[PDB]
Amino acid sequence: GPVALHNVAPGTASTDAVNVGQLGAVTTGLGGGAAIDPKTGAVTAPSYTVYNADGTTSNVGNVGAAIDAINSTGIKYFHANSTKPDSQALGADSVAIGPNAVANNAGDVALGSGAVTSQAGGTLSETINGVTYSFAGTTPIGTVSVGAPGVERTITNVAAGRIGQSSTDAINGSQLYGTNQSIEALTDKMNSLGNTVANGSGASYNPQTGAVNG
Amino acid sequence: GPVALHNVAPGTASTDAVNVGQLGAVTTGLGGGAAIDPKTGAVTAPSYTVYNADGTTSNVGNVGAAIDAINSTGIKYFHANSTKPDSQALGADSVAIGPNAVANNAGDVALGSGAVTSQAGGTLSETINGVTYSFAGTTPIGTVSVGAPGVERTITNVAAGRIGQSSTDAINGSQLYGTNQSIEALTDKMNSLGNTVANTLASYNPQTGAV
Amino acid sequence: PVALHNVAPGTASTDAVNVGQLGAVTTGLGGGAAIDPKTGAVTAPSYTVYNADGTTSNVGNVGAAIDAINSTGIKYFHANSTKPDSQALGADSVAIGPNAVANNAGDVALGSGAVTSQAGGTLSETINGVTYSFAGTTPIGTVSVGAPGVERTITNVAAGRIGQSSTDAINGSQLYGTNQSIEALTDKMNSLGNTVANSYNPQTGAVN
Ligand SMILES: [Mg+2]
Ligand SMILES: [Mg+2]
Ligand SMILES: [Mg+2]
Ligand SMILES: [Mg+2]
Ligand SMILES: [Mg+2]
Ligand SMILES: [Mg+2]
Ligand SMILES: [Mg+2]
């Protein structure tokens, strides 16, 4: 049967033999517990822990498998559950996250499956009853898209934002609701004004049009 | 004591000796500067650069350590600073980011520590003074959650969005502020109406609108 | 020039190594790394990494793969940049994209140059002397999508629930309907003013 060769110095020339001290240094480079057994000379495979998308982990026995898992199931704290095509971060300094996500322009962020960006443009103001109200944050560096036309996403668990001239905070539904209520509250007062003014001689007020008939 | 064995051809059978040439090719496979010293035979470890979450990097000397860093401190441009449990992307094609984040449904996104999604639902319109105003983006494919009930997040540094019937842009507080101002300005105008109307007749009540 | 046969696996550090032992190391590399059973030639590993432009590349060593991961990214998570790293400085914070900084516990910074500051709550608004209370008034952190002077729009946002307890984001079509309702009411008030005047000043509301 085969016999071990003893008393072999480290090889230097390319046609020199290699000893266990040399191979062991390379197995140490793999890490993950890879090692040479001192009794049998058997080589233990490395064991690398990778993180699945369902709250579990797996161990794999070679580097390629670990890289392939990183490029499919993700890394700890950053998971996409998909087999669909890769995201594309095409714009300079853009970020694209999730299957089929596409960040097209500089500084853009695409967040979510099938989220796609278009070039951001600023909105300076709104005009209501001929009065123009100016906005904060009117020269966007780019956009964060959370979807695409017909496949938009809601954004949920958003804390109420500041309301004021300089606010660049997002606004939630409880905030628009208060505003809506105030409009109807004002309307009730207007209908009062209309009716009390009507009171006369057959005179009337029509809330449908606001017109007093007298 | 030990002597080097020379003039060894590449091994082919499992019980053949290997030479330095063969070991060096495997060593090249590690990369990161791993090598065999052509004079002493000493093996240089690989050195891999990994990215911490604090603006610094570290170097590690084996592949396992690099994978563990990737799965703890993260990768360049994608960092979570945590030791709490992993995120979970449970929905098909979902994305979950940060400790304890959970994306529960198809196409959902969970963004942030403890961010949890619930199934998305559409909102078609609002009714004000008996008139119905229809919305854009009424059929959501999923939701982006940035928190959970009682542990919500503000969203900050949001540029003003388009305001129009087809707009699916988010709005910021300066935009709602303008609208709120228009309501009070309209109210000043109405108060003037009530008062000037009273004068032609008498008193006007701003509390109820009555003349 | 000549091969040594019938070598058993080495155990002590000064023992010779055989192909079976070296083969286990190539096997640990994966990616097709191998020793040719005919010639003894070593095949490099081949690892697929994912670029930021919808392409992939193959690299021939583990260092090159780690460097790709730390530059062009991983499948489904790409930043296209050569700028400095993001920094997640707060406990349990997340920072994504070049120069992004999450400064506080539980913060998220999302995008190139996105920076957070400590979140604060907003409780209510007061309109015509009436105070309206809000939902989600005690935030545990913020998601910043930019910084002062370099804000980001947020786009393709589905319409949010409108109601007292709603913590959904609102889109522009929703504020638009509300603005329309204001001008509709104003039309009615202008009719009120004109008909009562039968001058009516629509700019001030005054009837003379
Ligand atoms: Mg896990
Ligand atoms: Mg490196
Ligand atoms: Mg960092
Ligand atoms: Mg760094
Ligand atoms: Mg907010
Ligand atoms: Mg659009
Ligand atoms: Mg990759």
Side-chain angles (χ1 to χ4, degrees), chain A, chain B, chain C residues 1-207:
Chain A
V3 60
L5 288 179
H6 307 290
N7 215 30
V8 175
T12 53
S14 63
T15 55
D16 293 346
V18 169
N19 70 18
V20 169
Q22 289 177 300
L23 181 67
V26 178
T27 69
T28 295
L30 285 171
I36 306 173
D37 189 273
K39 283 169 300 180
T40 72
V43 178
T44 57
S47 186
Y48 304 123
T49 297
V50 293
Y51 287 69
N52 298 311
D54 60 5
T56 68
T57 64
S58 294
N59 295 336
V60 295
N62 66 86
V63 180
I67 290 169
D68 287 351
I70 285 160
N71 285 317
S72 51
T73 38
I75 63 177
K76 192 181 190 185
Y77 305 126
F78 298 88
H79 295 292
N81 183 28
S82 191
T83 59
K84 287 184 171 70
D86 199 6
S87 61
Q88 300 181 16
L90 303 181
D93 301 314
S94 71
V95 168
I97 293 172
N100 289 131
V102 181
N104 278 303
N105 311 277
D108 277 352
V109 182
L111 179 68
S113 173
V116 176
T117 67
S118 302
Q119 176 104 141
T123 294
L124 288 172
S125 59
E126 65 185 4
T127 300
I128 301 169
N129 292 327
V131 185
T132 297
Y133 303 93
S134 294
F135 294 156
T138 61
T139 57
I141 196 64
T143 195
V144 179
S145 178
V146 291
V151 284
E152 298 86 0
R153 288 179 172 77
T154 57
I155 305 176
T156 49
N157 296 294
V158 179
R162 289 169 284 193
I163 303 166
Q165 221 184 76
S166 67
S167 183
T168 52
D169 299 355
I171 291 295
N172 73 25
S174 75
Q175 303 184 273
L176 188 59
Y177 183 69
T179 294
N180 281 357
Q181 291 190 291
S182 82
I183 287 154
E184 288 193 338
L186 178 58
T187 301
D188 287 338
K189 282 190 33 176
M190 194 195 65
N191 293 333
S192 279
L193 173 47
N195 282 314
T196 59
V197 166
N199 311 336
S201 295
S204 61
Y205 165 76
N206 190 341
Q208 183 67 25
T209 66
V212 162
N213 190 95
Chain B
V3 64
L5 288 179
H6 304 293
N7 303 287
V8 179
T12 56
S14 73
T15 47
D16 295 340
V18 293
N19 62 25
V20 166
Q22 289 177 296
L23 178 67
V26 179
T27 307
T28 291
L30 287 174
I36 308 174
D37 194 294
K39 199 23 154 56
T40 69
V43 180
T44 293
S47 184
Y48 304 119
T49 301
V50 298
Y51 287 70
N52 302 307
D54 62 354
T56 72
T57 59
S58 297
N59 291 330
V60 299
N62 66 86
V63 179
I67 291 161
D68 291 346
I70 285 173
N71 283 316
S72 62
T73 34
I75 68 182
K76 197 185 187 178
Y77 307 128
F78 298 85
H79 292 294
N81 181 21
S82 189
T83 61
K84 286 185 179 56
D86 204 352
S87 63
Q88 300 183 22
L90 302 175
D93 299 316
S94 69
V95 168
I97 296 172
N100 292 130
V102 178
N104 280 117
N105 311 281
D108 279 351
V109 181
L111 182 65
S113 171
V116 173
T117 69
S118 64
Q119 185 161 131
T123 297
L124 277 71
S125 64
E126 68 188 356
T127 299
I128 303 167
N129 287 331
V131 177
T132 295
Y133 301 90
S134 302
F135 297 153
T138 62
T139 57
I141 193 61
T143 196
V144 178
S145 171
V146 298
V151 281
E152 296 86 359
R153 285 181 175 78
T154 60
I155 303 184
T156 44
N157 295 291
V158 180
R162 282 164 294 192
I163 307 307
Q165 194 180 67
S166 77
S167 177
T168 49
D169 303 357
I171 75 158
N172 70 24
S174 70
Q175 297 183 279
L176 184 62
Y177 184 64
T179 294
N180 286 351
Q181 289 195 302
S182 79
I183 290 162
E184 288 197 339
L186 176 59
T187 305
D188 289 334
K189 164 169 165 179
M190 192 197 60
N191 283 338
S192 167
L193 176 56
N195 274 307
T196 55
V197 159
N199 294 333
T200 62
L201 304 174
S203 67
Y204 168 74
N205 190 348
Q207 196 72 275
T208 72
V211 155
Chain C
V2 64
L4 300 177
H5 303 287
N6 211 31
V7 175
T11 53
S13 69
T14 58
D15 286 347
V17 170
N18 74 22
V19 171
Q21 294 178 289
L22 186 60
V25 179
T26 53
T27 292
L29 282 173
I35 310 169
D36 190 279
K38 168 65 133 272
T39 70
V42 180
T43 297
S46 192
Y47 307 118
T48 302
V49 294
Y50 290 69
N51 298 311
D53 62 356
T55 68
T56 60
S57 299
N58 294 337
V59 299
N61 70 79
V62 180
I66 294 168
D67 293 347
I69 289 176
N70 284 317
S71 56
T72 39
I74 63 180
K75 197 185 193 187
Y76 307 126
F77 296 86
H78 296 291
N80 182 28
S81 186
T82 59
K83 284 189 173 66
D85 196 5
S86 60
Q87 301 184 32
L89 303 179
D92 304 311
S93 65
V94 171
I96 295 167
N99 294 323
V101 182
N103 282 294
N104 309 278
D107 279 349
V108 177
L110 183 63
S112 173
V115 174
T116 67
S117 63
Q118 183 180 279
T122 296
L123 278 168
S124 66
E125 65 182 1
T126 296
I127 305 166
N128 285 333
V130 186
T131 297
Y132 301 91
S133 295
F134 296 152
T137 65
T138 311
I140 40 82
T142 193
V143 180
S144 176
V145 295
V150 282
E151 296 85 2
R152 283 182 175 77
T153 56
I154 302 175
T155 45
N156 295 288
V157 179
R161 288 167 287 186
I162 300 164
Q164 261 186 111
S165 66
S166 177
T167 53
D168 301 353
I170 295 301
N171 70 29
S173 75
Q174 300 185 275
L175 187 64
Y176 181 66
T178 294
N179 291 350
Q180 284 191 302
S181 82
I182 293 165
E183 291 201 336
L185 181 62
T186 302
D187 282 330
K188 295 193 180 187
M189 185 177 310
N190 276 351
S191 288
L192 176 54
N194 281 293
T195 49
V196 165
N198 285 340
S199 67
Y200 164 74
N201 194 337
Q203 293 191 24
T204 68
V207 166

